């Protein structure tokens, strides 16, 4: 049916550092904020899926 | 880099906005990034974990 939507939960398909995975990064942020924490990522930043976070 | 055990995999412990249940934000990136990022998360941010994201 229909519902709400707001520009908040966004997605950063990533990889994970340590495996390679296809991580889907649904980041609840704003699309310029997901912009400027997406500069990090092309800083330094990566994430790590907590399947593999947990496996280690 | 080369070695291992780098200054980087670090563990942003939020909640997710909809589970309302602990997500320990595995997120790879020195401290003072992560911090800005949770600037980001202190000023308007949440996370959507891949379970409630997936399922909604
Ligand atoms: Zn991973
Ligand atoms: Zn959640």
Known sequence: GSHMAEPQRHKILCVCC???????????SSAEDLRTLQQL???????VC???????
């Open 41 to 47: 990522f092309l800083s330094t930043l990566s994430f």
């Open 18 to 28: 340590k495996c390679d995975g296809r991580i889907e990064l649904t980041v609840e």
């Open 50 to 56: 907590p399947w593999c976070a947990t496996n280690q």
